Design a protein around this ligand. Sequence first.
Ligand SMILES: NC(=O)c1ccc[n+]([C@@H]2O[C@H](COP(=O)([O-])OP(=O)(O)OC[C@H]3O[C@@H](n4cnc5c(N)ncnc54)[C@H](OP(=O)(O)O)[C@@H]3O)[C@@H](O)[C@H]2O)c1
Ligand SMILES: NC(=O)c1ccc[n+]([C@@H]2O[C@H](COP(=O)([O-])OP(=O)(O)OC[C@H]3O[C@@H](n4cnc5c(N)ncnc54)[C@H](OP(=O)(O)O)[C@@H]3O)[C@@H](O)[C@H]2O)c1
Lengths: 276, 276
Amino acid sequence: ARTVVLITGCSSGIGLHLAVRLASDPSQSFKVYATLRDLKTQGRLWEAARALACPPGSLETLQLDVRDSKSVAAARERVTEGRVDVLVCNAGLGLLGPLEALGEDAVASVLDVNVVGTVRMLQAFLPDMKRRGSGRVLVTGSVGGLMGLPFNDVYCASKFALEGLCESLAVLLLPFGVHLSLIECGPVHTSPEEVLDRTDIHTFHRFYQYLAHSKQVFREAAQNPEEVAEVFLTALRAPKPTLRYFTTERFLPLLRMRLDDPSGSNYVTAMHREVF
Amino acid sequence: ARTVVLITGCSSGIGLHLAVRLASDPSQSFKVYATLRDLKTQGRLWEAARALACPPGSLETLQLDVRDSKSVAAARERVTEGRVDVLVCNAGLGLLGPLEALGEDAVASVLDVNVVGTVRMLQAFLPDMKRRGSGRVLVTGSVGGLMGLPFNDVYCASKFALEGLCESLAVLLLPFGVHLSLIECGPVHTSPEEVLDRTDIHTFHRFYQYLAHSKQVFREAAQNPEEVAEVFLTALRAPKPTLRYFTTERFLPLLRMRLDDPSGSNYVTAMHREVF
Ligand SMILES: NC(=O)c1ccc[n+]([C@@H]2O[C@H](COP(=O)([O-])OP(=O)(O)OC[C@H]3O[C@@H](n4cnc5c(N)ncnc54)[C@H](OP(=O)(O)O)[C@@H]3O)[C@@H](O)[C@H]2O)c1
Ligand SMILES: NC(=O)c1ccc[n+]([C@@H]2O[C@H](COP(=O)([O-])OP(=O)(O)OC[C@H]3O[C@@H](n4cnc5c(N)ncnc54)[C@H](OP(=O)(O)O)[C@@H]3O)[C@@H](O)[C@H]2O)c1
């Protein structure tokens, strides 16, 4: 039988690229349920699917909004095979700006989608995997869940939360045969007036500096989503997958500095200088 | 003038002990606003305050429920001095059990109180600190925000989120004169039928094992809250405070193992063996 994959957030970026990479695999090993918060956004996915000649029936789209457990449960029921071999929790939101300029609703949304939405997926799909003694869970991670980034406080909070969620689950899941892995990505190729009204002029200036620095890092280091999507495939095919896969080695040095001074002083100084 | 301190979650545990330690300081240097989600729980705080002979006016209680920005803003307005020198974000919730047995509401609450509630406090109080070029923010942290613990998936998610939140803020706040620090605590001295209905028998058994192990760690290693509260004082008086203070060195070895194998495999195996 085919490996059934269900992926969240497939309208663009990594989830879209992974869905068509799997559905178009030359071996035809995978059946992919590409889920999207809003089905009106499915056009790029189908344009990409056609461009890679995904065979008819290799790819199916479902509406699945991870903020609603009813949407999660209805998409689970639509899996005609009655099982999910590979669950990919990829749906996510960014949030950028001075902490005091972020709306309360925008903050709550990032946490609900990024964190509670993955909890909702794991509650809905983990129990069947545990009973079967098999299944693979891949979660899209970020360098921002491993080290704090200025002006990405809430986004980072959310990615760090996924690290804690997944590591805690991994400790239990070790002898169940169910494998969880984070795919740690760096940058991937996928109004000033309102921010200034909500913060001070110095923070606003630092924000500009962050943004100029971010643009340069992206221009120099953003990876193609095909390259990132393939790390998911690598994790899927490992007989004994590790908790974390890194899509690049570029941030490891910073990571090691961070990890080697538990007071946090070396990291805070080094990252302040790197960005500003 | 006195150092004005506002602390969240003062009904018991660390926040209660810190509030009276500060209010009763022999130098009478601090004016403490001890805030509590529900004022009906203030009795132990006042019993402790009397036992340490806090001078009249050294300690004041305000209702402050970090889930509501209106409650945050009304308590801020009650600070008669018009400034907060030291803000202590300590309010928190635990959540223990099999991930599939946790209510959706209980999950959302842990994140809203532990993460969005600290964001709400920082939005309300950081701007005045930044304008003044001074102020200290202390956040109660946990060993669970530094490494994942089985059956504490959502709690850990929330503590890891605070690490990401605070580290991201610290990178920006470096040149503003506003100091943020996490106080990293280990264990501190502060129905089966329903869990079994929501999970499988094997997970339920592992849960028992976790709980027996947890009880032994607590019995052997829980620190007195006076000792933990004093680390907050240490951070407050440091001229150049670090991002993190540890209340104990007991988990550093585990922390270093975790940090030295970024694949996460060594930690997951070691912690599985430690608990089970
Ligand atoms: N791109 C990078 O530089 C980078 C780096 C490290 C990690 N990552 C991670 O990669 C994942 C995918 O992002 P991309 O692939 O990089 O970026 P992307 O295009 O932002 O992908 C995110 C996907 O999540 C979906 N989504 C948002 N809210 C959702 C909800 N409530 N329910 C279901 N789906 C929802 C988005 O769709 P709608 O917009 O239609 O809601 C979009 O399809 C994210 O978890 C992101 O954090 C990205
Ligand atoms: N105790 C440990 O073993 C340990 C270890 C590491 C870190 N910590 C951290 O220490 C902090 C304090 O806990 P303790 O001091 O250890 O435990 P605690 O007695 O649980 O303290 C938590 C305080 O948070 C309050 N709280 C809960 N929801 C709130 C809300 N919505 N608004 C305002 N306050 C709220 C609680 O009051 P109500 O119950 O009345 O809401 C209580 O006063 C927590 O952040 C905890 O994670 C504890």
